[PDB]
Amino acid sequence: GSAKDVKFGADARALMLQGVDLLADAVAVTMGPKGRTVIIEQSWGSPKVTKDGVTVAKSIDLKDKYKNIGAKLVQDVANNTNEEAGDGTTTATVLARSIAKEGFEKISKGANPVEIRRGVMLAVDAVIAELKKQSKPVTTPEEIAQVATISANGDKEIGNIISDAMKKVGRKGVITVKDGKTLNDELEIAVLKVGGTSDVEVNEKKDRVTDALNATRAAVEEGIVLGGGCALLRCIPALDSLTPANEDQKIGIEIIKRTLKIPAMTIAKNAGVEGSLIVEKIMQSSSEVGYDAMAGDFVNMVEKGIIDPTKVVRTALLDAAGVASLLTTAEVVVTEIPK
Amino acid sequence: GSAKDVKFGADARALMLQGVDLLADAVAVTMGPKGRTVIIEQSWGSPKVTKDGVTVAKSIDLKDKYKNIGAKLVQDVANNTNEEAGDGTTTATVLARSIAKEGFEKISKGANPVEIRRGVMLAVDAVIAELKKQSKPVTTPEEIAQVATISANGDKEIGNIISDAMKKVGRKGVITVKDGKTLNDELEIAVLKVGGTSDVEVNEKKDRVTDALNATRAAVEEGIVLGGGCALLRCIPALDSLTPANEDQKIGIEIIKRTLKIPAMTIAKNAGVEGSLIVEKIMQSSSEVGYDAMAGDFVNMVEKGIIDPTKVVRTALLDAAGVASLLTTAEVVVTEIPK
Amino acid sequence: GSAKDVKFGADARALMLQGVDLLADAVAVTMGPKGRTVIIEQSWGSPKVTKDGVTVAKSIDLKDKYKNIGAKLVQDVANNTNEEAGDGTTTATVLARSIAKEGFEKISKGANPVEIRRGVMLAVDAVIAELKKQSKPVTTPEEIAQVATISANGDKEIGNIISDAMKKVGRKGVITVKDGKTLNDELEIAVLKVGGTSDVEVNEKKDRVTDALNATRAAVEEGIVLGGGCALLRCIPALDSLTPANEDQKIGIEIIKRTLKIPAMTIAKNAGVEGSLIVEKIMQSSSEVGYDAMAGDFVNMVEKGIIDPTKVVRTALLDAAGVASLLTTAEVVVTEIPK
Amino acid sequence: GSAKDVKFGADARALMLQGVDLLADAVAVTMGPKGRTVIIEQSWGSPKVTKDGVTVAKSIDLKDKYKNIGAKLVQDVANNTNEEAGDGTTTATVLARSIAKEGFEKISKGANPVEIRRGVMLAVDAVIAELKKQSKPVTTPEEIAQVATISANGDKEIGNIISDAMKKVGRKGVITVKDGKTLNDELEIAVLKVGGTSDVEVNEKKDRVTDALNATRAAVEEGIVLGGGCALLRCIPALDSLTPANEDQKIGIEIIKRTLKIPAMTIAKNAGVEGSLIVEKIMQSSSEVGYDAMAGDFVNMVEKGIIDPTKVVRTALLDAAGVASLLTTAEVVVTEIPK
Amino acid sequence: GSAKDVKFGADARALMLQGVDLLADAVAVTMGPKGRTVIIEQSWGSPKVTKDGVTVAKSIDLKDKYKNIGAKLVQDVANNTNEEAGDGTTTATVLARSIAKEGFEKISKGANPVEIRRGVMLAVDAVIAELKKQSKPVTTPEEIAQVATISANGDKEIGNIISDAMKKVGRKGVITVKDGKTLNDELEIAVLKVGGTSDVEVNEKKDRVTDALNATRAAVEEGIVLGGGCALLRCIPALDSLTPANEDQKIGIEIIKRTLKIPAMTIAKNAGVEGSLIVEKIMQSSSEVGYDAMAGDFVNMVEKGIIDPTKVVRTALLDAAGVASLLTTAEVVVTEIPK
């Protein structure tokens, strides 16, 4: 009914990529241990300070229709990752942005983006198989504490509290988080009360505790892989083994291969160092060796406790790859007229 | 009641042709195996990515009144083709655009567009008779699988699932598509669950599965002709045999004869090659020989499985020809004032 | 109550004649066998393509108040002709435009437009008497078929269907038209189902079938005269016989005499030839000889079947003449201020 | 849903710092004995004249979205300090502004604001421990009178009335303030009636009496420290003893160390003298020696009666530090479009 | 002739003070060893980078008429100081700004600014007498080297070159500066060639060499006092000894007494430390002890070589005080209308 504006070819792709880049640049400043926070103005009260990828993504709406379409697709990526895992939304956002950019710049007159998407799906399936091959189950409560601490932005006390809750009520016991009226966090028999002074602080801490609980639930329901994005880096040889069916599938496989390095470079970049050199030295190093951004040095991640649930990284990669690959098949964009 | 703007002669025809060209150019980028997708912004939620001709056509509304009139007529073509067949909307759209363009360009002071329309109807009846003469019934389930795969953008798994459903519940059994909550497609006794990661992917896959089911229902209800637009190409000698009654009917017959080459040229164009040379080599080739765009070579279509239901192409040609021929008879266009 | 704008003399007449000319030029492109169609944008859905004079006239509303007054008067002419006959609206529109133009052009300081209107009424009464003298009753079903075919824009099948209906249910039997769900027209016992592919096509065909039914009902309720506007051309000697009472009545008689040639010239003009030469050759020819526009040659009207009901032409001439003659008497025009 | 504006890096930090500086500069003109008042226009009646920090803070709302975000955060600081103590809102506001300013000015590419916030929390915990170590309980009613007088802007009669009320109904007795209909303050058995001539005067006096009652309740529920900001100045050696864990924690500790001098400097500034010299001479002086701004000379605070509840200063420092340190971690600010 | 705008009272004073503050804030960032540079856009070529006070002052012209009047007066101060000394323009600018500010702030209905100006003149005469009493003549070439190095922004090579030139051509010999075509500075028999790479660098170095030569010429023509603004700080007791004749002269004497501390505070402020504490510790210290900003510690000025010509400081103080005191007598300002 309403009048529509139709955009063709690389112009619409460029506008959507600008929107995706804006949303992903806003989200990616909160990734890793040395990541900052984002203040979102709240209409009815005090602003909200958050380090969560999905919370930042869902709060960004753009005036331009095509940039808003791209932003909405990235929000879909982040929301799907949040609902199916509870953690890993920033990683999914950066992976989706990388895949979308790689697919957009590789579109030519003779290229077939549908077969590129197919090759992306096969590459992601291979990477997921490698990740499942590289997982190790959680056998000790210390691993649970390490996972909770890593997912709580390196907070020892949150991990200790979650480990105590899992010891008290069992590994599969019901655990919930409710805001506390005191300065410190406490545990009741499980119910977690979050300490703080203002509502913004308790909300940020509650978001981090919820992320830690979701991540440790995923880590106990599935295996454990290395942290820092190195688990995704170790799957490049799996893609090297695969053979393409045609040129477009080769393009998609190379897109996924280039994207697999993105989380580690983002984590290093937030730490103030050069991500490319860090990733190159990680790949040249041994399989057990990774990069600690908080300490800023190459260590053994299992010993240091830098580990991630394999479910979180698996679902983040899958959602980001699927949505971005579907996006790259675009040729025409139809939007409503901005009345 | 409301004030009206009245436009005469070739100016209104040019404006309506511009609207038709815009809508058809938006639609035609999704035709054939190497066709891209279209993102349509949704008012209430995430945008919709589709490769369906009728879905793209129905979502385009223009501000200019005359361009909107042309777009509405092309939307009528696409909607009628979708309702009476369930597939072939893009072919009907491109055929309607071609017929409208040729009819508009052949209008002179002494020309009679009504007799041109009559000649167009005679030519289309002859082509439909030839298509019915060239059909072959479906006798093996492998033909059903080939038809479903071709109508599902070359997806082997969709064709296999539909063939399994037809084996289990019979050729005339009740089959429906419902969105799945898992990663892969599954069959229940028939009900199809569509796999995916996000809603956009499952919606696109559901649209393709519905297209495949409608096309295979048409293919079992009627005969089978060659794919790739070659079946419509083989009917040119039938038009050569026909004799006109006057000059206007000859003009209409030549309009239909030139339009018959449009689908194959569009399919080749989406593949990144020159449509004219492909169509010429197809016409010089044997009757069984057609052009495979995915493989990009001249093959035997029945052996390779590039086949189409004759009902789909028949109704697409009929609807497009009727509506476009009625359009070409225009001399005056009356629209409402854009208050 | 509301503020009014008052216009005097030839300026208001010129504006009103501009409005009348616009509406009549829009309507007259659909007159005769070689007439085109008009697309009218519909607010709630798809546009409507029509060849009907009254349908085109009723859909034109002008922003300018005086042009809209003229257009409204021409719409009155067309609607009265449609209601009292069911056919002949385009002929009435062109006759009304011609009479209004000649009446406006012949107004001077000493001229009396009321006596000119009186002379117009006497001339039209004489022409109607001549038309009644020249009529011949319908005695054979072939005449019914010819009348239906002529009134259905030369469609043989519509005339055959209507003749079959009149044979089945009698000449005065109840016959109605309802839209069909199939490709071809069919008859039930009388109910007519109209075939087609899209709603626009069935609507145009329904309008033509309704026109044919109304025209054949008029032709069976009254006599038959020659088609192509020749019947109105044959009444000029009747006006030559008449003697005026004063100068103004002579002016009116000459206005009607010049207007009597309008329909044939319009039919020839839509055929792409010179109307003046065709009318002159018809007048120099024999009484039985007329001009076939579809064949583009001078033939015998009765033998070829180009015949019209006398009631349709009689009422079209009467309505057009009355309204236009009343129109030409204007000196002052009062309109509302365009707030 | 609504369109959002996203600002990155130091620009958003500068805008929020401008908003914070505006609100804190408005608030800080009312600190100390030589502080002025603020008139806030009331929509429904006469304006309100107040010397209360939270009342001034809550009444300032800025049009610019980022400045409004900063102002809202400072309002959160002031409101939390008012709710948890009843007094010390101006001190909390100035401390929060100072901490936010130093945190913003120390942000670099390699700096980690989260670890800076951690160091700030450690330093504040150390300062709170020192304040608890330096407290002395209230043992005499003269101390209650001194605390009430200090918190009532040096009003002897308010302190005398509150001391009489505490003698009559006990230290923990229920005491409330109600506006009086007479010129002078009176006490009933406890209910305080505030004297005055106009509603503005009685409102200002009621605000000061409520502040005095809350402060003396805190002073009787906890210990007593030196006034004039000297108690917060005496805790710098406690920070000197502390050792950092890394560079960012050292930055945070130095931020808190520099902030600890803010209240005394502001009190001196409102008195028309140089705050830096006063603070330096206070630090060089003995522990019991502080600066009397009303007398404008260095005296013994306990003997002169310049004392503060330790709870008020403790909670003001804690709230200001927490909220400001959370603010300094900002990198991206998302606001609504000013429609 | 041209229309005039007249401003009365404190509004014009505030506008002129804003202009003076703008110019002085621009100039004062280049004072002391830790002073930055100023880039002034040149109309005909590359911009000019300078650390010279008069060069920055003369390049600032304001659009507002009253601010431009204040800026023009400060430019007069700087130009007179440059012409009569060759050095000390920044000190004169900051002294003039301080005197103007205190004079403007101390104007009341009963105050007499003319007698305040008189008291300022007596105070400045007393300070000049103290400066002449505290001077010591140059007896060694090492003192010449120290003076040249101090006036050349601590450049050892410039001081060495100037000392060599004075050894070669005598203490009163003719010495000039000409731009060099080589990378390093050289001396010919005296002519100084300034090294560098581009014109901006050689221009900045030439300005510093000219400043050093003018300062050492003044230092040999007159005595030597302590650097860092300590020489002006040591004259406060001389003002303490003076007795006023009335209240306005006391106000002027206190204005000069407060202004005498400005250069040292500015030098400390440019070094990133608190000027008030540095000045207080300098005044509490011994007469020979001053503050080295480059080393950032309290040292012996004569031994370290931080010395200034007494003529430069004397003329800077005299010019600044005279012009600013004349300015403070303002009551009415008349400007031209900005056509």
Ligand SMILES: Nc1ncnc2c1ncn2[C@@H]1O[C@H](COP(=O)(O)OP(=O)(O)O)[C@@H](O)[C@H]1O
């Ligand atoms: N100390 C550390 N050194 C290196 N990498 C780390 C460290 N702590 C966490 N990480 C990595 O940073 C990621 C956490 O980023 P986060 O902000 O939680 O993004 P998301 O919410 O998308 O998981 C984890 O994948 C983890 O591997």
Ligand SMILES: Nc1ncnc2c1ncn2[C@@H]1O[C@H](COP(=O)(O)OP(=O)(O)O)[C@@H](O)[C@H]1O
């Ligand atoms: N591999 C192939 N090679 C050549 N032509 C193909 C191939 N696959 C499908 N086609 C042709 O492309 C058409 C399908 O286009 P499609 O996007 O479904 O348009 P529509 O929806 O109008 O049918 C079919 O008519 C088929 O003949």
Ligand SMILES: Nc1ncnc2c1ncn2[C@@H]1O[C@H](COP(=O)(O)OP(=O)(O)O)[C@@H](O)[C@H]1O
């Ligand atoms: N083949 C023909 N040759 C010449 N005149 C024709 C022919 N067919 C129809 N006509 C004339 O054209 C007229 C029909 O015009 P039409 O579009 O029906 O206008 P209206 O609706 O006002 O009758 C009839 O009066 C008839 O005499």
Ligand SMILES: Nc1ncnc2c1ncn2[C@@H]1O[C@H](COP(=O)(O)OP(=O)(O)O)[C@@H](O)[C@H]1O
């Ligand atoms: N005579 C005085 N000399 C020095 N400091 C004082 C004097 N009276 C009060 N103060 C200080 O001023 C502060 C009171 O400021 P106030 O306006 O109450 O701010 P707040 O409402 O935030 O406490 C107290 O902390 C007290 O230490």
Ligand SMILES: Nc1ncnc2c1ncn2[C@@H]1O[C@H](COP(=O)(O)OP(=O)(O)O)[C@@H](O)[C@H]1O
């Ligand atoms: N190392 C130093 N430590 C302290 N003061 C210094 C040092 N070097 C120079 N100064 C002081 O800084 C002043 C030089 O400032 P400058 O930029 O030359 O201003 P101006 O051009 O007005 O003299 C001198 O008066 C000198 O006393």
Ligand SMILES: [K+]
């Ligand atoms: K994050």
Ligand SMILES: [K+]
């Ligand atoms: K399609």
Ligand SMILES: [K+]
């Ligand atoms: K007509």
Ligand SMILES: [K+]
């Ligand atoms: K206050």
Ligand SMILES: [K+]
């Ligand atoms: K300088």
Ligand SMILES: [Mg+2]
């Ligand atoms: Mg996380």
Ligand SMILES: [Mg+2]
């Ligand atoms: Mg299809």
Ligand SMILES: [Mg+2]
């Ligand atoms: Mg008709």
Ligand SMILES: [Mg+2]
């Ligand atoms: Mg108080």
Ligand SMILES: [Mg+2]
């Ligand atoms: Mg100098």
